[PDB]
Design a protein around this ligand. Structure first.
Ligand SMILES: Nc1ncnc2c1ncn2[C@@H]1O[C@H](COP(=O)(O)OP(=O)(O)O)[C@@H](O)[C@H]1O
Ligand SMILES: Nc1ncnc2c1ncn2[C@@H]1O[C@H](COP(=O)(O)OP(=O)(O)O)[C@@H](O)[C@H]1O
Ligand SMILES: Nc1ncnc2c1ncn2[C@@H]1O[C@H](COP(=O)(O)OP(=O)(O)O)[C@@H](O)[C@H]1O
Ligand SMILES: [Mg+2]
Ligand SMILES: [Mg+2]
Ligand SMILES: [Mg+2]
Lengths: 371, 55, 371, 55, 371
């Protein structure tokens, strides 16, 4: 039979059968209970709208993501999300399909063990396998080397790989991602008068960020230009009218990636954690990693980031090496495409964690040889 | 007028002292119980070392 | 010369010369045009009564506050209020006195720039400086660390400070304040038969709230007690007779602070936004912030709030830390006392925005080094 | 007047409140100091046993 | 007059007058500039807190060590540290006191030359001498032979000495030390959920390592025991509450010393570089080196290391030789005690690099006869 390539993510759940080009169903991972009282009788009001249904009734819900930073903080809601994904968005019972979840690097063990225990006890799948979210993104590019920066919505991690041999001592995981950029944008919009507070209006700020923000090639020059002319002010129409005008908030929101001091984080930007991740590698594979830097994940879709990052790394790196940044147009679904490719391989067909194996060793089987 | 202000102020004034009195005595009792705990722990190994004084 | 420490606030304008203990003139900030026709000739009827004069003729006026939530929505009325404050309540021409306004955190820029432009062009002061309303309240307590919850009448904001270094990423500004409590009290009084609608009767409801309401130590027990006995029903005499009896409306009005779901607001109460503001701080200064929690602002004067808040935070916080809530008796004027102390300092004497500096850089000088 | 017989009490509770607040602040501080000292002593004993743990 | 026996080290600066038993002032060598903005005026905020002062205000600083691996990477900060050490922790002007610095073996020349140039030009000492950090640790043991393994916090080096004649061809310097163990512990703590990222929280992880970690006598048996029972899980209270429980991370952090493959280093552990250092020596002094193996440095203070190392070497060495490991209780300050003894000798009194000699030959005098 065919395998189910699910990809929990944090912000958008992407799923679909193995062997295709794009995920079959992509929908936000939010579960929102209603918060008001409700007076109409017999309206058929449910107790929790999940997935894309709660992005249409969000006016009277309190949306809450079940995955904070890679890790899962609310297991009941995550189980509800998985149940919805299997039964309503794909309509395939899990009793007859292997599953291939994905997990960020350096995550707590208990999260992974609970994930496999749920998949084997509640949904009762035949066999499931958990894979690191960066190796798949490297599969999708058709490479076999390269250092991949997978800046998702929950957590940004940077896994270097050479000739198929991952370097476990050079993984640099940073917890700045799309959600913190949404919060920072929502916080700097208040400098013009627009106040978004409700958890429903966070979605509106996210839409503003997606449609308007861009990464500046040079920050100081843009700050000077936006403060003199008015060629940058782009307007946007809220879900009820009252258009708003975003000035130099456009390139200040995604600039947080390269200067995490804006949101008070100490660490260095995504332009310098990649160079540090490279320098921890051996001295003889640094040229190949320099030449095959891969971008993935949703948050790396800002217009103009593949040039800013290349300029920064070229500034840091030695002058002789060639710096090349692979930015495929299908960046958002790169991890899932790689997952489909991996699940479609014949050599991989014996790596699944078969159910009888789980019955013999318990949920701690995932840390064992079947990784 | 100001009479009512005086009545209200005085009536509310009595509230704070009496409630705090019980908390003060509870604090004293707990402090003394803990000090007794420490003193009981203090003398034991003290005498143990007194025996261990030059073996 | 001496400095003028004005403090616009929202609900009560507090002003006075720097270096004293209490503001010289405290009066509501309302400007009310008459609304009826007027038949007596030569009575000397003015077109707008401002300040404390319109709290005595409020029977035939339509009072309207010029400051909604920290921000200023009606600049002409605010200019009128400032003119009254300078010329009639203090009787000092502004041409010979520096001014020190105060502003809530996270307010729109245009508000601050317009404020400085007015102060420099219309009143023509020698030099003015704008300060955040929470740092002053921390000055007045004589501390140098601590997290201050300044629940005014317009907006409640919670600024944590350590060793004099403010943490800009941990400011949690919430727009529930005394005015919303007045409106909610006016809305729940209708459950007994008393209807207050006119903008003049909002003042009567405010007086009821000030004199009778108190914060319950435990909400459910009080709701149960008030529903069985009658030891809580306190009566109050309206400005014309017809005494009213307030039952369990007494502790239900200020309970909205700890459960903003009562007035339909989504966010968490003032008992949980303080804990969230602390948890955003670094891991090594949380003990000091726990031990030096400061209360300020008018709305924190409810009888019994310094115990309810301590109980709530002790429930949330780890069991080992000591939770202490500083509630000085001079809470209402804490911000202004701190402002006087700051204006009286010698080290601060060179931070004023001198007029020649404004002439060279325009009103946008306030965002620059002279903050 | 009737004012003074209550204002006498109104001012009276001020010093009451001041004494109670300073006393309770000192009580909690010294109690926490004692608890920290006891914790230190207990940890000293246990970890001194475990640093030994035979040689 | 008396000599100043300073000992730069990397992690703790230890200093004191010659002829005593213990260093007078021991304090971490970190210089941390503040990173937030700072709103209180006149608080007396300095621009850089060094030494033990920055371990109390570390909540709002960015601590950065000026010595990476023995070598000094930031000369201005090191000069600041020395100035603090002389003037505030000892309060003796350097114009009237000889100094005896210490330096790891096989360090870059430029580091040593710059050190002597600073000491002679800025602080203007009468005479300074630089000594290898292992010979002093051999002095303190009162021996004259033996192979000393000085596992500091920056770099671990293993200098064999016989009858006072050092063997320059048998020094094995390895760059794994306490700092890498701190980083590895901080990296494996993430497997339970505790994430420490800030440079201030590295100090908390260091405290955890010091107070809880221990070296296992046999690694596999401990890994099996910790995975079945729960007799190892020791808890620890963070600087704000929220106690944490360390499981088999206790003996996995310091195990990196004997298996440097954990942090990706190729080389062999400290149990096998000592045997290799011995085998490079001549065939007739191997028995004495076997019998007089000396431990020093801070990182060799783990509970149970003097038995694991002896077991390993006994496994490697021939069965007839007796293996003895000298582990004095004053291990941490062994280098400084030896430095005091050496500076107190009469025979050594003419080996100092007198200032007139430096004036005649420049800073390159240190490599000359006055070593
Ligand atoms: N076109 C876009 N431009 C800018 N940002 C985007 C765009 N699309 C998505 N994002 C950001 O990326 C996030 C989605 O990232 P995604 O790759 O789905 O995360 P995950 O790894 O959890 O699947 C969204 O929250 C959004 O903030
Ligand atoms: N004694 C009191 N008891 C309860 N509430 C009060 C009391 N005094 C003032 N308030 C509330 O506080 C508000 C005044 O707050 P204030 O601190 O003057 O605001 P601002 O920060 O604008 O100066 C009033 O509107 C009133 O609702
Ligand atoms: N009691 C202890 N237990 C375990 N490790 C320790 C202990 N004391 C110090 N250390 C480690 O040793 C380091 C200090 O080593 P030290 O000898 O001061 O280095 P240096 O040679 O630079 O002076 C610290 O960073 C710490 O990691
Ligand atoms: Mg992803
Ligand atoms: Mg105020
Ligand atoms: Mg050393």
């Amino acid at each position: 039979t065919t395998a189910l390539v699910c990809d929990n993510g944090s912000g958008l759940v992407k799923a679909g059968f193995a062997g295709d080009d794009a995920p079959r169903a992509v929908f936000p991972s939010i579960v929102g209970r209603p918060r008001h009282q409700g007076v109409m009788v017999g309206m058929g009001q449910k107790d929790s709208y999940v997935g894309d249904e709660a992005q249409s009734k969000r006016g009277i819900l309190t949306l809450k993501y079940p995955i904070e930073h890679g890790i899962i903080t609310n297991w009941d809601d995550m189980e509800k999300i998985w149940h919805h994904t299997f039964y309503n968005e794909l309509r395939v019972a899990p009793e007859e399909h292997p599953t291939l979840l994905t997990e960020a690097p350096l995550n707590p063990k208990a999260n992974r063990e609970k994930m496999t225990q749920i998949m084997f006890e509640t949904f009762n799948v035949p066999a499931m396998y958990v894979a690191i979210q960066a190796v798949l993104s490297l599969y999708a590019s058709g490479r076999t080397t390269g250092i991949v920066l997978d800046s998702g919505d929950g957590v940004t991690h940077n896994v270097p790989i050479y000739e198929g041999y991952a370097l476990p001592h050079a993984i640099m995981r940073l917890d700045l991602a799309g959600r913190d950029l949404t919060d920072y944008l929502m916080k700097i919009l208040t400098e013009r008068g627009y106040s978004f507070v409700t958890t429903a209006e966070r979605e509106i700020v996210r839409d503003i960020k997606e449609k308007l923000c861009y990464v500046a090639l040079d920050f100081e020059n843009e700050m000077a230009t936006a403060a003199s002319s008015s060629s940058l002010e782009k307007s946007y129409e809220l879900p009820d009218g009252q258009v708003i005008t975003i000035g130099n908030e456009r390139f200040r929101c995604p600039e947080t990636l390269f200067q995490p001091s804006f949101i008070g984080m100490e660490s260095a930007g995504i332009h310098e954690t990649t160079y540090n991740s490279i320098m921890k590698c051996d001295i003889d594979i640094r040229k190949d990693l320099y030449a095959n830097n891969v971008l993935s994940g949703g948050t790396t879709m800002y217009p103009g980031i593949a040039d800013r990052m290349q300029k920064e790394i070229t500034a840091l790196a030695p002058s002789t090496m060639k710096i090349k940044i692979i930015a495929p147009p299908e960046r958002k679904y790169s991890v899932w495409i790689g997952g489909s490719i991996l699940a479609s391989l014949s050599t991989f067909q014996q790596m699944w964690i078969s159910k009888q194996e789980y019955d013999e060793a318990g949920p701690s089987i995932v840390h064992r040889k079947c990784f | 007028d100001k009479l009512k202000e005086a009545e209200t102020r005085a009536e509310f004034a009595e509230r704070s002292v009496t409630k705090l009195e019980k908390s003060i005595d509870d604090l004293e009792d707990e402090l003394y119980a803990q000090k007794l705990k420490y003193k009981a722990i203090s003398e034991e190994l003290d005498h143990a070392l007194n025996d261990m004084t030059s073996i």
